């Protein structure tokens, strides 16, 4: 009957079962799920299966100065228009499945190391197109509640950097993953450290630190050495702009303690100019590829001192067994210094 017919909005709402209880509690292993479609997309007002032509609706009202009259397309002509519409209908469907590849991260099914774009513009149109955002951890934590039982939120740890020394990190939490991405991405832009790079490609000196139970041992390296570090450190180093460094992480691999410990050490390092001012002496550099040629990298800003820095006969430095163990002639692991792709 014509009186038992409902609108498309009501037909799709029921058929899709989106508002149904089962979907809300996630009680189905979603597959082969119905996909909504708009059926008025390619329909032109005035076009029917019978192929009638209506002046002023689906055909020109006046043609070559002649006032048109009602007409109908021939069976052959109608079969052509019907065929052309089918081609357009199929063309749209194939485009729906077509997608644009995005680079994966550390693994194919993980969010770690995935670029999610720049942070959003600021209050006064402060664009951050020069900044890139990378994900370091996505966790599905749970808070037990009386109303909802186990309740799930998305906790995202991201880092941001412009590749020119400025970088920061933040954590964003929400019930939806997309929201946690926005919260963390725009929060991290408010916590930008500036990291000092020696000659724009490496740290000024070796850095050893313990943050909580995570240990990091970074080493200054020459050009062309590349990043040989934890995958998270490679991601953060690319954001900062460091190009050549070695690092080892031991103890707990907590991503937050590694991110906080990394920025802590990298932000509290000492540039050569700072050391020259503190001690009043020239800072000289000796490269083995330049021979004995002395290279002055920093000169004291004020008055140059005349008391030589004391050189002990035997220094009391505290050495790490791992570094010293190599020069003692002990064997390294089979996993050490394996051939890897350029980082």
């Amino acid at each position: 009957s014509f009186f038992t017919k409902l609108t498309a909005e009501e037909l799709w709402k029921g058929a899709l079962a989106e508002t149904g209880a089962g979907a809300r509690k996630g009680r189905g292993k979603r597959t082969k799920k119905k996909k909504r479609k708009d059926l008025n997309r390619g329909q032109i007002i005035g076009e029917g299966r019978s192929g009638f032509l209506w002046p002023g609706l689906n055909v020109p009202l006046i043609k070559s100065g002649v006032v048109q009259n009602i007409g109908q397309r021939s069976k052959e002509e109608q079969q052509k228009v019907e065929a052309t519409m089918v081609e357009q209908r199929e063309e749209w469907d194939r485009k729906r499945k077509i997608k644009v590849k995005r680079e994966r991260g550390w693994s194919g099914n993980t969010w770690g190391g995935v670029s999610i774009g720049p942070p959003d513009p600021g209050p006064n149109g402060e664009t951050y197109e020069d900044f890139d955002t990378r994900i370091l951890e996505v966790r599905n934590v749970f808070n037990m509640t009386a109303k909802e039982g186990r309740k799930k939120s998305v906790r995202v740890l991201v880092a941001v950097g412009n590749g020119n020394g400025a970088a920061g990190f933040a954590i964003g939490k929400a019930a939806d993953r997309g929201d946690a991405f926005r919260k963390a991405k725009n929060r991290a832009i408010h916590y930008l450290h500036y990291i000092e790079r020696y000659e724009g490609h490496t740290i000024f000196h070796d850095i050893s630190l313990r943050f909580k139970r995570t240990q990091i041992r970074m080493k200054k390296q020459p050009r062309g050495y590349g990043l040989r570090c934890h995958r998270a450190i490679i991601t953060i180093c690319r954001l900062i702009g460091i190009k050549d460094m070695y690092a080892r992480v031991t103890g707990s691999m907590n991503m937050l303690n590694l991110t906080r410990g990394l920025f802590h050490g990298l932000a509290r390092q000492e540039t050569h100019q700072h050391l020259a001012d503190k001690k009043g002496l020239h800072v000289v550099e000796f490269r083995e590829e330049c021979g004995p040629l002395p290279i002055v990298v920093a000169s004291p800003h004020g008055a140059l001192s005349k008391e030589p820095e004391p050189e002990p006969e035997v220094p009391d430095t505290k050495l790490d067994w791992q570094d010293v163990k190599a020069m003692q002639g002990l064997k390294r692991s089979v996993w050490f210094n394996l051939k890897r792709p350029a980082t």
Binding site: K29, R30, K99, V100, K101, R102, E103, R104, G105, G108, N109, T110, W111, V114, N140, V154, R177
Partner: peptide, 14 residues
Amino acid sequence: HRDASPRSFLLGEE
């Protein structure tokens, strides 16, 4: 546990 993976983002279905 399956649809929260980056598959949809890494394919381009945005």
